[PDB]
Write a protein that binds this DNA or RNA. Sequence first.
RNA 1: CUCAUGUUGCCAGCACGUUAUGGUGGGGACUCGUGAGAGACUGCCGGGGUCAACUCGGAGGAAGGUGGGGAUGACGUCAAGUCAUCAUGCCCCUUAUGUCCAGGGCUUCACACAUGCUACAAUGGCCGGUACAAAGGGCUGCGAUGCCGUGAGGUGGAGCGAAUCCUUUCAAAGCCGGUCUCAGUUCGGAUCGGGGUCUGCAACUCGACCCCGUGAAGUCGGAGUCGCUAGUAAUCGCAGAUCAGCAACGCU
Lengths: 99, 82, 126, 155, 116, 60
Amino acid sequence: GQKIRIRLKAYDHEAIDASARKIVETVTRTGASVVGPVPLPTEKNVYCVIRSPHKYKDSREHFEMRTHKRLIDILDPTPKTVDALMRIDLPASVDVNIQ
Amino acid sequence: PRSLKKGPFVDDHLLKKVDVQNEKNTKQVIKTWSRRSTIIPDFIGHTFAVHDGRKHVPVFVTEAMVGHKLGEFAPTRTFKGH
Amino acid sequence: PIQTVGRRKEAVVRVRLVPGTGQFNLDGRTLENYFPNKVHQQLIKAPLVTVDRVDQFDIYAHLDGGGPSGQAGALRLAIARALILVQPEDRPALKKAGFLTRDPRAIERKKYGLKKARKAPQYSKR
Amino acid sequence: PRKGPAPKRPLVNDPVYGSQLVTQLVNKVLLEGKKSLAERIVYGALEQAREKTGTDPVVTLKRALDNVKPALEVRSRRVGGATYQVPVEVRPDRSTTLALRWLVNFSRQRREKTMVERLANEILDASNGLGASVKRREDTHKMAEANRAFAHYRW
Amino acid sequence: ARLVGVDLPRDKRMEIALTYIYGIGRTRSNEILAATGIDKNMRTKDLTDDQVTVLRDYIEGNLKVEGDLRREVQADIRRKIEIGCYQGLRHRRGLPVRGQRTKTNARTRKGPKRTI
Amino acid sequence: AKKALVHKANKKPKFAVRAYTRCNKCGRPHSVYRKFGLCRICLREMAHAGELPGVQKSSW
RNA sequence: CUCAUGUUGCCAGCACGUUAUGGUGGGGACUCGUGAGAGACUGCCGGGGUCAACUCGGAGGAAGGUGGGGAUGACGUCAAGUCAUCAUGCCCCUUAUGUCCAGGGCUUCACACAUGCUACAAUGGCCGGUACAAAGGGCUGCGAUGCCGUGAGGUGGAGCGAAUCCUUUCAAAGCCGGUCUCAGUUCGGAUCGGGGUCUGCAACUCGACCCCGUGAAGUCGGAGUCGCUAGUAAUCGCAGAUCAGCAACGCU
Ligand SMILES: [Mg+2]
Ligand SMILES: [Mg+2]
Ligand SMILES: [Mg+2]
Ligand SMILES: [Mg+2]
Ligand SMILES: [Mg+2]
Ligand SMILES: [Mg+2]
Ligand SMILES: [Mg+2]
Ligand SMILES: [Mg+2]
Ligand SMILES: [Mg+2]
Ligand SMILES: [Mg+2]
Ligand SMILES: [Mg+2]
Ligand SMILES: [Mg+2]
Ligand SMILES: [Mg+2]
Ligand SMILES: [Mg+2]
Ligand SMILES: [Mg+2]
Ligand SMILES: [Mg+2]
Ligand SMILES: [Mg+2]
Ligand SMILES: [Mg+2]
Ligand SMILES: [Mg+2]
Ligand SMILES: [Mg+2]
Ligand SMILES: [Mg+2]
Ligand SMILES: [Mg+2]
Ligand SMILES: [Mg+2]
Ligand SMILES: [Zn+2]
């Protein structure tokens, strides 16, 4: 029994959902068992900046850095499935780490 | 206070100058541009001219002030009162 | 199997009802041992006191998150809801008493530039 | 308060005895928001008063509040460049609340070296009529009946 | 009681009676009482002469107190004021030596307030 | 920021202790966040222009 | 609230642990985390209303009359702040007011003002036992167990680009037991001396932390003046931004 942790980690909800959908379709066509895009807590990075230089600091605002990560545990890593995952071309908005 | 493991810190150029002075036995006033140099027993009878930013002020060192930095005895600010 | 969940100010609780005796099982210890507060015991027993079916249900509780009062209130709501589930005939008296209405208040967002919650920094005209 | 009378909270009753006056007392004496500390101190002082007096704590508290609750007060008013005081009747609810306030105020500022016993002793003194609270009530009534003359303003 | 010319309190715990000695403080008193094995809650009425004598011997053997400490502090003061050190100048001017905010703080050292 | 000072900072210092950020373009040595490599106003302007893929206003 | 959903997350119902806890085989029956939809629209009834807006009360409901808090600054005023962010017109230096480095400074004080913590003691100081949360940071960084230090920390280094390994089982207040009987106090801790650890080539002006001695002012405060109308006011904690070392009681 071997499992491959396909890590999906992107910024945009639309982008991550689309990449996950493409992965599910590819796996289903190739004939391998995948649990699916198991939701994971989204890391939150908040940064505070002042309005303008030279004082006027009482009023502030925050910027977040959205990071959505999904878990894809694929069972039965078929050679054809791994090759297809290598050859799949994904948008720059999604980076896949295989471990 | 400086840690004992690291030990006292002495600038190499001033160490060379004082070594030459004490080896030749000549005692003169040496222009000192270092404020971070600690005192060593070898400075017992050496005169150093420390720079306060305005003019090199000579200072005479004796055994009494062992364990203290050179800049401690050279005032940097003038305060005449009010 | 009867199941229920109660939440209040981030106090999620679990309760499982059993027509056996009136035993209180809070994470393996009795109610008196867990959170020994008279106000707590009173509010936890308020629903069964209102329904007048004391010493007839056994409850096992699993608690995660929240504070003492939050967990106690969530457990009260959970047992009330489980009682309604097993017997909805007490609906009109229990809703009039207010046991089946959840408490929709929790920690609220607090402003940038304010100390916390609703706090305000010292505001002097000098 | 410009729009109108605001709603009043539904204050809870004390389950230990059965009188909301205990809840009011603990809330008034709340210092730095330590509810358990305040209630335990209040209960201890109540038991101390009970064992000191040999009577019912609820009955003696009722006697004290009845004795100390005023019925007339004084309000400040300035008209025509001169300051004056007018007496105005007070609702019994506010009278009881202010009586509790004075009870706390005079349970704060005496030198018995231990406030847990001292609050009980102050309660006994107020019940007996030798208390600083009853002295303050005497003074307030004296002021009101002295300023009775300016009652024509009616505000 | 009395010890090294110091009149101990009429009624007070030994951990503070020894503290009142110039050369001994709170944690030092705790340490000496722990070493001697004497409990720290007893009052000043329960002491015994032999314990006082042995304590005096121990403290004089392993520490210097009162006059010796004062005179050696003053010796440090005069040597630092004579060597022309920054601490000596600060002592001359009557100010803390660490270089705190003398603009507003150091009121304790400069003493009362005088209005110009 | 003076160009000579910027160039000197970019040069390799003789001691490792002499390393500091000096926000890239505007050369502001203060109010700079390490990961971004840009100062407060630089971050404000670039984020408002939307030039960085992922920063956005805050409302939660 | 309904549907989809089971790992590094939880356990309804079954088996293995036998002191270490779902730890392990198993399982969506609920939270758990992230996708879709419904739900507040005066929805309905009675009275006032010009039969209209609008208003009071009542039933259902989680919410009743913009549920709560947010993102969200119409034309303009204050020649308001910012050539020390950046760019920009004009004058000025060019052999200097440019440029590299050694030491010093921005931390100086006979005083004043503004913002914060410590208090001014028993609702308490101190000692022993003892249960309850959130979220985020971690690559030239967090740092396990073990060993030596009172403690700063010293050796070592499992687990980690991270629901997994560390930030202690995230605690403080809270509850029980003991001393203090009101003292310039066992409250309170600044100032001044004697010993060490840590980062840095470089701790005297000029950092921070640990141990000791030192024991000052201060007993609720003057006219005046400030914030606060529900999870509100008060009180007690945790993490992060800048950062090798910190001025961290400030800010988020
Ligand atoms: Mg201001
Ligand atoms: Mg630097
Ligand atoms: Mg900068
Ligand atoms: Mg399970
Ligand atoms: Mg306008
Ligand atoms: Mg202008
Ligand atoms: Mg102008
Ligand atoms: Mg120009
Ligand atoms: Mg220009
Ligand atoms: Mg020019
Ligand atoms: Mg020039
Ligand atoms: Mg230079
Ligand atoms: Mg400065
Ligand atoms: Mg504080
Ligand atoms: Mg050790
Ligand atoms: Mg703990
Ligand atoms: Mg102290
Ligand atoms: Mg002290
Ligand atoms: Mg302290
Ligand atoms: Mg005082
Ligand atoms: Mg006092
Ligand atoms: Mg006043
Ligand atoms: Mg730093
Ligand atoms: Zn910049």
